[PDB]
Design a protein around this ligand. Structure first.
Ligand SMILES: Nc1ncnc2c1ncn2[C@@H]1O[C@H](COP(=O)(O)OP(=O)(O)OP(=O)(O)O)[C@@H](O)[C@H]1O
Ligand SMILES: [Mg+2]
Lengths: 339, 230, 284, 52, 52, 115, 85, 115
């Protein structure tokens, strides 16, 4: 459903940030790891990433302790005053390895035969990912740097079976983390990739993690999609409806169309920002048809062609104000003249 | 703090975690599991925690405990065991919060088994029954109004709708922590004050005030002041 | 039982309940349109029937086949029905009441001729055994008198060639937003009125053109107007019945959800208990 | 009034001609952009391959 | 003639835009062609240089 | 089996099973949509299945304490006659409650007279 | 385990048995892997059509419970499936 | 992948999957509420879905003993062409069995002529 794809695209998007990246391949078959590695050097920089590999052919202890070793490597950067991003591919397979180890040592079994302390496995694994204040990092670095604040962001991956969320390992991990990106399967089969599902996927940290321009231009997307979900069920067999509901429905359908993109194409904050602005300010309202992908590509090409300075300013600042609002209006107004 | 003669509040961040940690410890010790995989001593451990939270001839400990129900299953042994000890239930709603009403407590799903006439007093009890039934009737008329329209309603029906709107807004309250979020100084409403306010709204007094007079206004005597300015 | 299949059924019933709610929305909107169209139609038919009512007691009179009270050898019925389902039992009740009166005439040896305005009526009465002499189906969301004239034209020819003696129209009355009733009404041979002759007001246009031909045209208009108002009222009744049925279906779907979920929860709990028992016992 | 109709018609025809000129000029600009960017991208990827 | 001039202006606008469109699509085809050619050139060079 | 119990008894029992199985199938349609969306034949079999279910009941002598109704003993010929009559629609004109807690079919007719 | 071993299955169902279909064989859930080889040539020839006919009959019967009128191709298959059943 | 396979091939596969996914959600809708509740666009989608789901079938040389028919081998280009034609509606007017148990789409039109 795209778990690996989303993880590796985040890693690729950290090419030019100060954020170092780590990819932990647990139980992955070897040739897939080779494909991912070649993709990482091919579509960007593998120079910024540490790749920890434990294929299905290696002993259970090695697989069990691979994510902890990756955690140590990330924790180095965390306490050096620098930011980092780590991905744990298939934490469920690490749980499987721990199950095997515990059972062969004759330790008492639990709910799904897992040992009693599996929660204490994933909990102490994940609670090492944090943001760190200046005094801690300055004392740790012994004064090498004085005012910075390091961090280690974590993006673990879990495989549910037929989408059962009440299983032991998934529920433990869901309790441990703060926010989940839920990837539903029938949206992926429908071609809406990436297949994230609003309403079930939340972020417990809130809008304090967003940059200002992304925060301003994303508040209404939530509402539009929420209204679309319930009104589209009525859409399939309805006509002669209230025009307010008609527009709400149709705008929801096209904003759903907008939030999908090719696999190895990451998008900068300015590009995402102006596309969301086009959706929110209504510049797509008269273009609510199949062309939206080509329309987005043409808009990006045109903006690159003649209005680059705003792109640079937005990418550098992430700021938003009246002048920026009007400049975005001018850009969209000019683009509507072109193809 | 109880032995000092005080009435204490004990906040438990999640009782489900206490139960689940009990399960983990029991598994580590190797004892045979019961029911849906829980520890053989679930009820005893829960009782040991809960039986100590009581009122003594001097001092007391009242407790607010956050509850999570696994798999949304209200028959699951941890919810079922926990509910045997709860005296009251407070439910917080995203829907109520979206309207801007704070605290975002849903009055229809929240209950307390103290709410009986011989426990709380006949007047308070019948006031609560009236408020609950009126809000329920408004929740049904809201579906009807959405589907057909307000032209279908009678004058009695319209009056019920209006009073329900006023009641819904009078439930809101400015907190002292809400000073920084809203600027409103924040207030503390006594039991008799809130009973008098809701009795007045139910029995037709203040039908001449606008519904916004009751929003974040504290007591009813301050609602009339807000309406005087408004 | 079984966890995955029960969860599949739960998903399906959830989706069906949501769809029934949406269908209720559509039904309510269509009822609004239908009732305003009825409001438009009401004055024209009301005035025309008042006209023929005063003609029931005028002086300087002359005869007309649609006016006199001739004997009954066979009876004609103009039957309105839906072409769709999910409207409750409106068509069934109307058909049953017509069957009752047709049985009453069959007791007297009087035959029945039937003209249908909807597909359900055509199916019901061709499979039951009523003599369908005219039929039109699939009128549409906005019905028009133009297409309905044809069956009425056939019934009028049956009367005016002398074969058909008494003619009725059957339809459901839009008594209220939430209440309706099936009715059978006397259409062609003029019903009774309470009056005496009004001797004079203005001018007796009657003999400027031919009285007979003009009266013929007027009564044509009268019958057509009655039929059109009946059809519009029945469509309003159809939308009301459909919205009621959809509401009932939604509540029943919720009822099934709240019980299938109990079966699912007990199944999950029992399955986990069994598997854990197997593990612990197998440790040996 | 017929004189006014003719005047406005000629103005609109000339305006359409000018818009056509600008639109086709932007088409040519796009063509040049695509061609030279493709050349540069090709050389960039080739140099990367030999470095690898 | 006023309405005919309106129609003529709109038609001329759309015709000019479509004539720009054909240029754009031809340029896309050319970009794909040249990128494929450069990829083949560099790849074969990789093979022979590393072998030797 | 017809070789030991006779053909009329065997046919009556199999017909009862067929009708009740069809009624079970129709229940899940009725639960969501109600009885209006059924075929007319389906409504007929629903009515007869409900009447059959009511006719399966019987007031025992030993149960006279819990209820108050006098007990009843029914012969095999009577019961096969009654179920054969219901299956072929001889008693379509009687209400359902006439068949509840009665003995032979004659008793059900008498009960229907007093409703 | 036993289902995994054998060269075929013959399923007998309570619903079919109560409905009066005896023997209560359910096609589409029962198959013979030896297939047409385990028949006389006449029986092979004639049974080939029956096998598909009943299985697709049940699909049509489920798919068209409530359509009062129907296309007579599907009507023919529905009635023929009833005959064969 | 549109890179690994022809870009055309990728789009064809994605479209087929999208259509069949849209049919599965409508299965229970139509089963309970009826075929004519659909919009005409929905009914067009239902038609194309059933035709597509027939065109996935195939006779095998080694499945010839079970069925009594010859075996068919279809080249990949022909498969892409046939499914592209079906989705684009070039064969909207053929019946469902014209696609069932055939090879290339030319064989589909030949069997349609025989039908
Ligand atoms: N946006 C996208 N567009 C097209 N294809 C995509 C997109 N995102 C993912 N895919 C495809 O989805 C498939 C599965 O991707 P991915 O391996 O990331 O999924 P997963 O859920 O993590 O799988 P698994 O658990 O089997 O490893 C791949 O073939 C990939 O090309
Ligand atoms: Mg993957």
């Amino acid at each position: 459903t795209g778990k690996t794809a989303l993880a590796i695209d985040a890693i690729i998007n950290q090419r030019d940030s100060g954020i170092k990246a780590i990819y932990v391949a647990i139980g992955q078959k070897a040739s897939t790891i080779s494909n991912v590695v070649r993709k990482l050097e091919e579509h960007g920089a593998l120079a910024n990433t540490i790749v920890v590999v434990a294929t299905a052919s290696e002993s259970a202890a090695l697989q069990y302790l691979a994510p902890y070793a990756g955690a140590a490597m990330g924790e180095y950067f965390r306490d050096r005053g620098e930011d980092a991003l780590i991905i744990y591919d298939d934490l469920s397979k690490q749980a499987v390895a721990y199950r095997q180890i515990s059972l062969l040592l004759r330790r008492p079994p639990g709910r799904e035969a897992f040992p009693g302390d599996v929660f204490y496995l994933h909990s102490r694994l994940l609670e090492r990912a944090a943001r760190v204040n200046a005094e801690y990092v300055e004392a740790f670095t012994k004064g090498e740097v004085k005012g910075k604040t390091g961090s280690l962001t974590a993006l673990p991956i879990i495989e549910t079976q037929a989408g059962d969320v009440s299983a032991f390992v998934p529920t433990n991990v869901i309790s441990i983390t703060d926010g989940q990106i839920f990837l539903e399967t029938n949206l992926f089969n429908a071609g809406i990739r990436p297949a994230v599902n609003p309403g079930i996927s939340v972020s417990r940290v809130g809008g304090a993690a967003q940059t200002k321009i992304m925060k301003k231009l994303s508040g209404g997307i939530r509402t539009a999609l929420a209204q679309y979900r319930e009104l589209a069920a009525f859409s399939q067999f309805a006509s002669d409806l209230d025009d307010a509901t008609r527009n709400q429905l149709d705008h929801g359908q096209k904003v759903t169309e907008l939030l999908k993109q090719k696999q190895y194409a990451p998008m900068s904050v300015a590009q995402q920002s102006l596309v969301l602005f086009a959706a929110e300010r209504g510049y797509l309202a008269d273009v609510e048809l199949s062309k939206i992908g080509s329309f987005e590509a043409a808009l990006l090409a045109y903006v690159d062609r003649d209005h680059a300075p705003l792109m640079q300013e937005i990418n550098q600042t992430g700021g938003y104000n009246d002048e920026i609002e009007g400049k975005l209006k001018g850009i969209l107004d000019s683009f509507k003249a072109t193809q | 703090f109880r032995d000092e003669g005080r009435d204490v509040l004990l906040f438990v961040d999640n009782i489900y975690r206490y139960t689940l940690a009990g399960t983990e410890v029991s598994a580590l010790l190797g004892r045979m599991p019961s029911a849906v995989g829980y520890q053989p001593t679930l009820a005893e451990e829960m009782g040991v925690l809960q039986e100590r939270i009581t009122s003594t001839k001097t001092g007391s400990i009242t407790s607010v405990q956050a509850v999570y129900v696994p798999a949304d299953d209200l028959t699951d042994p941890s919810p079922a065991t926990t509910f045997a000890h709860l005296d009251a239930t407070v439910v917080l709603s995203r829907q109520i919060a979206s309207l801007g009403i704070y605290p975002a407590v849903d009055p229809l799903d929240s209950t307390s088994r103290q709410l009986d006439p011989l426990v709380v007093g006949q007047e308070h009890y019948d006031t609560a029954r009236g408020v609950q039934s009126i809000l329920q009737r408004y929740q049904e008329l809201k579906d009807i109004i959405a589907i057909l329209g307000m032209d279908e309603l009678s004058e009695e029906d319209k009056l019920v709708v209006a009073r329900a709107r006023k009641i819904q807004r009078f439930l809101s309250q400015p907190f002292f922590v809400a000073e920084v979020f809203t600027g409103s100084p924040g207030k503390y409403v006594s039991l008799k004050d809130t009973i008098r306010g809701f009795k007045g709204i139910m029995e037709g007094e203040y039908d001449h005030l606008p519904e916004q007079a009751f929003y974040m206004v504290g007591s009813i005597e301050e609602a009339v002041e807000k309406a005087k300015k408004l | 039982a079984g966890a995955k299949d029960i969860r599949s059924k739960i998903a399906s019933v959830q989706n069906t309940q949501k769809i029934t709610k949406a269908m209720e929305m559509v039904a309510a909107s269509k009822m609004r349109k239908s009732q305003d169209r009825m409001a438009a139609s009401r004055p024209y038919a009301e005035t025309m029937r008042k006209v023929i009512g005063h003609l029931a007691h005028g002086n300087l009179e002359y005869k007309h086949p649609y006016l006199e009270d001739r004997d009954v050898k066979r009876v004609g019925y103009l039957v309105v029905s839906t072409d769709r389902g999910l409207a409750g039992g409106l068509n069934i009740n109307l058909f049953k009441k017509l069957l009752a009166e047709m049985k009453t005439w069959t007791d007297k040896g009087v035959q029945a001729d039937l003209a249908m305005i909807g597909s359900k009526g055509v199916s019901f009465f061709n499979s039951v055994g009523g003599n369908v002499v005219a039929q039109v189906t699939g009128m549409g969301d906005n019905p028009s008198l133009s297409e309905l004239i044809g069956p009425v034209k056939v019934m009028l020819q049956a009367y005016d060639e002398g074969r058909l003696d008494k003619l009725y129209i059957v339809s459901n009355k839009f008594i209220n937003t939430m209440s309706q009733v099936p009715t059978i009404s006397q259409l062609l041979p003029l019903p009774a009125s309470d009056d005496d002759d009004l001797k004079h007001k203005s001018w007796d246009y009657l003999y400027e053109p031919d009285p007979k031909a003009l009266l013929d045209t007027l009564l044509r208009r009268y019958v057509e107007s009655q039929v059109y108002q009946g059809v519009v009222e029945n469509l309003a009744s159809e939308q009301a019945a459909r919205m009621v049925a959809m509401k009932a279906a939604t509540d029943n779907g919720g009822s099934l959800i709240k019980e299938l979920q109990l079966v699912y929860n007990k199944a999950r709990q029992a399955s986990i208990t069994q598997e854990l028992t197997e593990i612990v016992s197998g440790a040996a | 009034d017929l004189d006014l109709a003719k005047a406005s018609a000629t103005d609109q025809l000339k305006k359409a001609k000018a818009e056509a000129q600008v639109i086709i000029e932007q088409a040519n600009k796009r063509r040049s952009q695509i061609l030279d960017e493709a050349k540069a991208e090709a050389e960039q990827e080739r140099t990367k391959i030999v470095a690898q």
